[PDB]
Amino acid sequence: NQFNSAIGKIQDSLSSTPSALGKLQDVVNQNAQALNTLVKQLSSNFGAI
């Protein structure tokens, strides 16, 4: 009974409560944002005309 119930509680927590995958999200963010930088750097003048 008990281990079923715990599985169900994991089921609600991952279904409704957000921010449960913060680690994986953070990794994806931090990569995507390094790219958006490096792109956004690609349009700098660095002293040129």
Binding site: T37, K40, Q41, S44, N45, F46, G47
Partner: protein, 48 residues
């Protein structure tokens, strides 16, 4: 470790508007450095 933050603008220029316009015209390196500096602090707090 010690949690350090560095004001990239001031540290590079130090209260110089024309140096500031040059560096903003140079790209957005100050964000990355800052925001790694944060990451690295809030990681220190998390070790403890």
């Amino acid at each position: 470790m010690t949690k350090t933050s560095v004001d990239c603008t001031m540290y590079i220029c130090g209260d110089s508007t024309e140096c500031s316009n040059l560096l903003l015209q140079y790209g957005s390196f100050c964000t990355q450095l800052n925001r790694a500096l944060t990451g690295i602090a809030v990681e220190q707090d998390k070790n403890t």
